[PDB]
Paper text:
Maternal embryonic leucine zipper kinase (MELK) is a serine/threonine kinase in the adenosine monophosphate-activated protein kinase (AMPK)-related kinase family, and was first identified as a maternal gene in mouse eggs and preimplantation embryos. Out of all of these potential roles, MELK is best characterized as a mitotic kinase, as its expression pattern highly correlates with other mitotic genes. At the protein level, MELK is hyperphosphorylated, and reaches its maximal abundance and kinase activity during M phase in both Xenopus embryos and human cancer cell lines. Due to the potential oncogenic role of MELK, several groups have developed MELK inhibitors to validate its potential as a drug target.
Numbering used by the authors: 0 to 154, 170 to 333
The structure:
């Protein structure tokens, strides 16, 4: 109802719907106080049904994941019938779009993108999580052409799922993510899937078999990294630690993947704390302690959006 939007519309101006993926809608919106554009995931609690616990799973995970290549959660607002998630806006489109418009990426272009994927996923695993749904549709570009991983509903698409997922057997989520990243690496450099079939049963068999075509344009180093990631035996898959400084990964770079987060939880920006304090009528030390609770209310949304507004070189001012 209109009651479900009262608190929301005190903080954001709604623009057009930019996507109806899954069972939720995502709208473009503008944070009134800072002017920064955000994405708002709208969910109807009476409609989510049994997919509703997975929404709590994604929120709890997003509250615990803060990293330059993970879509940032700014604000969680729950009403009587709606759950609102205010997220980092990614106008650059999906990695799916980038691949399909450049029928395939070169090895150099692939390394630029893949190193960001390895960065996000390695950080996810360092926090005790596994994504379990890695796919080009879940990686978006911002306005700086930097990748952002989205959709933590599981902590999946069949062509990216590891064979042990297909059989329904037990599995470690981290090893399942490495397989999907191997499928990602193949798609990035070939433009098509390594295992594909119009019939699901035939795709089941092709995945579990593990054999795939190796196009002629793949470098020898690309091939061996692929077979190091696309191992049917999950215990023979390359680990994440070995991926961070893998020879292929480091070609043209000569430094391992910077997987650790730079967006902190501890340190606060004094310019942002100052601008916030002179806008809520309370002393600065109280404003500093309130921000540090990280409730993902309007306060933390305003802080991190003002933080991002500052990084863009815009004046660190409110409204
Ligand atoms: C079908 N799913 C699996 C893949 C689709 C999902 C919608 C995407 N999307 C658009 O519809 N237009 C552009 C666009 C721009 N900024 C976005 C910012 C955040 C999110 C976001 C973040 C999280 Cl954490 C999350 O859970 C969800 Cl659902 C969305 C989506 C955005 C977006 C496109 C890929």
């Amino acid at each position: 109802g209109s009651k479900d939007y009262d608190e929301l519309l005190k903080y954001y101006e709604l623009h057009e719907t930019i996507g109806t993926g899954g069972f939720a809608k995502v709208k473009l919106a503008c944070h009134i106080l800072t002017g920064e554009m955000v994405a708002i995931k709208i969910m109807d609690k009476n409609t989510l049904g049994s997919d509703l616990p997975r929404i709590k799973t994604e929120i709890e995970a997003l509250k615990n994941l803060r990293h330059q290549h993970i879509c940032q959660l700014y604000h969680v607002l729950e009403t009587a019938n709606k759950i609102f998630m205010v997220l980092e806006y990614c106008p650059g489109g999906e990695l799916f779009d980038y691949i399909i418009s450049q029928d395939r990426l070169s090895e150099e272009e692939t390394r630029v993108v893949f190193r960001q994927i390895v960065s996000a996923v390695a950080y996810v695993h360092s926090q005790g999580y596994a994504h379990r749904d890695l796919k080009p549709e879940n990686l978006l570009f911002d306005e700086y052409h930097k990748l952002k991983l989205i959709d933590f509903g599981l902590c999946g698409s069949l062509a990216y799922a590891a064979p042990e997922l297909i059989q329904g057997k037990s599995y470690l989520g981290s090893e399942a993510d490495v397989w999907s990243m191997g499928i990602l690496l193949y798609v990035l450099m070939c433009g098509f899937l390594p295992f594909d079939d119009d019939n699901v049963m035939a795709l089941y068999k092709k995945i579990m078999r593990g054999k795939y075509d190796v196009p002629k344009w793949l470098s020898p180093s690309s091939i061996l990294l692929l077979q190091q990631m696309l191992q049917v035996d999950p215990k023979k898959r390359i680990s994440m630690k070995n991926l961070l400084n893998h020879p292929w990964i480091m070609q043209d770079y000569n430094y391992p993947v910077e997987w650790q987060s730079k967006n902190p939880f501890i340190h606060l920006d004094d310019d942002c704390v100052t601008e916030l304090s002179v806008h809520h009528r309370n002393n600065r030390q109280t404003m500093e302690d309130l921000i540090s609770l990280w409730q993902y209310d309007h306060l933390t949304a305003t802080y991190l959006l003002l933080l991002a507004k500052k990084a863009r070189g815009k004046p660190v001012r409110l409204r």
